[PDB]
């Protein structure tokens, strides 16, 4: 009681200097944002419907390409991974450094956002992927062209890695709330999408299965929770768009926590809102790398 005005005076004086530092940090970054970052992604001559056709046409290096899935569709940029497994992979989602905000609304997730690709060293082409989400209209159109497979890969902060391969993958259109279906699992990451979280059992595990779910963003609730209160939402402000149930065993589009480990008291709404794959690392580990890649199934 007598020794109480000592540390309690220094704790508040610590916090006020922390607010001054944050105040300065945010302000400095704001000046940097007076002008944008730039790229010069000169376009490969070789094009096709997607990245599989492109590799069949001799496009054998991983980089940005222009694809035109349909003559009715405007040609658009994508990162093609030509090296993983048999190549021909169209990247639809990528995380690697937290350089892009994935806490976005319905329209951004609909249209696509982030950086497809960036220039490497002093090259006149963009051979490195950026962080991005291709866009739900585009993802739906690609998966519905024919049987499509899905490769999800992730890496922790120690350099270990696992994968989740889904031989079958489909995304319905906006009218159908971009409903997801996955099957034919194999891999090392654990079947989070079909089986739910491996640490949960019964009802509680079942309510984490993503297969069959609709897409929701924090301004568009299509999750598993049917209760009429704003407090019960899987996607809250600055939360990722994902195929939420009640709520998730996995969220590739979660918030990028540095170093991997995070806790409830670091999270904006006290939830496990990170780049998560519970079946590998649990709810409170945020991946260092996470990506999603599709390809026509053969």
């Amino acid at each position: 009681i007598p020794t109480n005005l000592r540390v309690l005076r220094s704790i508040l004086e610590n916090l006020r200097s922390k607010i001054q530092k944050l105040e300065s940090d945010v302000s400095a970054q704001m000046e940097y944002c007076r002008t944008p970052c730039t790229v010069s992604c000169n376009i490969p001559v070789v094009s096709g419907k997607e990245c599989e056709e492109i590799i069949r046409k001799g496009g054998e290096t991983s980089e940005m390409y222009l694809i035109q899935p349909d003559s009715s569709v405007k040609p658009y940029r994508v990162y093609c991974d030509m090296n993983t497994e048999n190549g021909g992979w169209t990247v639809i989602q990528n995380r690697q450094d937290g350089s892009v905000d994935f806490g976005r609304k319905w329209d951004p997730y609909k249209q696509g956002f982030g950086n497809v690709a960036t220039n490497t060293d002093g090259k006149n082409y963009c051979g490195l992927p950026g962080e991005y989400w291709l866009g739900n209209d585009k993802i739906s159109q690609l998966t519905r062209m024919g049987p499509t497979e899905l490769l999800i890969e992730m890496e922790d902060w120690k350099g270990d890695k696992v994968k989740a391969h889904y031989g079958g993958f489909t995304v319905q259109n906006e009218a159908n709330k971009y409903q997801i279906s996955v099957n034919k699992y194999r891999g090392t990451a654990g079947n989070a999408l079909m089986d739910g979280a491996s640490q949960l059992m019964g009802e509680n595990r079942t309510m984490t299965i993503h297969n069959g779910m609709f897409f929701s963003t924090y301004d568009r609730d299509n999750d598993g929770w049917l209760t009429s209160d704003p407090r019960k939402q899987c996607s809250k402000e600055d939360g990722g768009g994902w195929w939420y149930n009640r709520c998730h065993a996995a969220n590739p589009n979660g918030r990028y926590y540095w170093g991997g480990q995070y806790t409830w008291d670091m999270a904006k709404h006290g939830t496990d809102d990170g780049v998560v794959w519970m079946n590998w690392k649990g709810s409170w580990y945020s991946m260092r790398k996470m990506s999603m890649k599709i390809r026509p199934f053969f």
Partner: protein, 57 residues
């Protein structure tokens, strides 16, 4: 007298905010000319968070 020891409540708000700001500044690296090189000292926050609960026992 004034037993307003709710500085443990402001300490919690600062921890969230530090992390939230760290994430938000980082998300500017893909938008803006320059990205501010910075860190978060969760160790400093928890060392003095270990206190307060210590001096109030």
């Amino acid at each position: 007298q004034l037993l307003q020891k709710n500085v443990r409540a402001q300490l919690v708000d600062m921890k969230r905010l530090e992390v939230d700001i760290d994430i938000k500044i980082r998300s500017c690296r893909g938008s803006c000319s320059r990205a501010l090189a910075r860190e978060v000292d969760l160790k400093d926050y928890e060392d003095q968070q270990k206190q307060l609960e210590q001096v109030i026992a």
